[PDB]
Amino acid sequence: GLGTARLQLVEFSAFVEYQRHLFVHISLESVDVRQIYDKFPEKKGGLRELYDRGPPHAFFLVKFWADLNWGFYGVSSQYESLEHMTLTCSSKVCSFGKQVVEKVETERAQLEDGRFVYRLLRSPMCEYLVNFLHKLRQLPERYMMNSVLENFTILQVVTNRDTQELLLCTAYVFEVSTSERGAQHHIYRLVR
């Protein structure tokens, strides 16, 4: 599972509008973090520096095989925790390791069924990704899509807003699936 004892990601989907097409969706083996340093900014606030501060158990890699065979572009996600917190979520989109978008959002805890849930429902997909998907979709071969996506990564850092503690850091890498197989993901622990 993707989480610590303090915070867990229970669901994530990126979609375009049953009547929904999921590009990627989440409803453990380990990888050496130094093998993916280059995929993210190596200067201040990079993966190496984040991993240096720790804690090591908060670091995950997700590989997505996206369904690009298909409106409103949206994202939904749910985190959970047993302690009431305010979350700061920083997403960085990187192209050839260079940061091209950073988005910072705040999410407040909602008490629900004995636990705290941090829910985004039908949130607008960020403009950079919408425009990228519009172009990626036109490609005639899956292998060409994979060539374009091998340089595309996303780093997501979730911190406790009030303490500045890192709660969860996830690196995302992308390939394309077939429409027959549909979307898939695998989650890995980042170790050093």
- Determine if 91 is a binding residue for ligand QSJ (CB under 6 A): yes
Nearer residue to ligand QSJ within complex by CB, 26 or 37 = 26
Stretch that binds ligand QSJ, among 29-37, 53-61, 117-125, 138-146 (CB under 6 A): 117-125
Q: Which amino acid is at 106?
A: T
- Taking each helix axis as running N to C, give the angle between helix 127-136 and helix 142-149, from 0 to 180 degrees, rounded to the nearest 10: 150
Burial (Cβ within 10 Å: 0-12, 13-18, ≥19) of residue 130: middle
Work out which of 10, 31, 117, 126 binds ligand QSJ, going by CB under 6 A: 126
Work out which of 103, 122, 137, 186 binds ligand QSJ, going by CB under 6 A: 103
Which secondary structure element, helix H or strand E, spans residue 148, and what is its range? Answer: helix 142-149
Nearer residue to ligand QSJ within complex by CB, 81 or 156 = 156
Please give the residues from 36 up to 65 whose contact with ligand QSJ meets the rule CB under 6 A.
none
- Determine if 75 is a binding residue for ligand QSJ (CB under 6 A): yes
Going by C-alpha positions, the residue among 23, 63, 153 that lies closest to residue 99 is: 153
Nearer residue to ligand QSJ within complex by CB, 81 or 153 = 153
Provide the minimum distance between the beta carbon of 77 and ligand QSJ in the complex, in angstroms, as a whole number.
7
Kindly report the backbone phi and psi dihedral angles of residue 169, in degrees, each rounded to the nearest multiple of 5, phi listed first: -135, 120
Nearer residue to ligand QSJ within complex by CB, 106 or 113 = 106
Work out which of 33, 61, 154, 171 binds ligand QSJ, going by CB under 6 A: 154
Listing DSSP states for 6-74 in one string gives: S-EEEEEEEEE----EEEEEE--EEEEGGGGGGGS--STT-HHHHHHHS-GGGEEEEEEEE------EE
- Determine if 134 is a binding residue for ligand QSJ (CB under 6 A): no
Listing DSSP states for 165-179 in one string gives: -EEEEEEEEEEE--T
**Which residues would be at the binding site for ligand QSJ (CB under 6 A)?**
14, 23-24, 66, 75, 91, 103, 105, 123-126, 129, 133, 154, 156, 172, 174
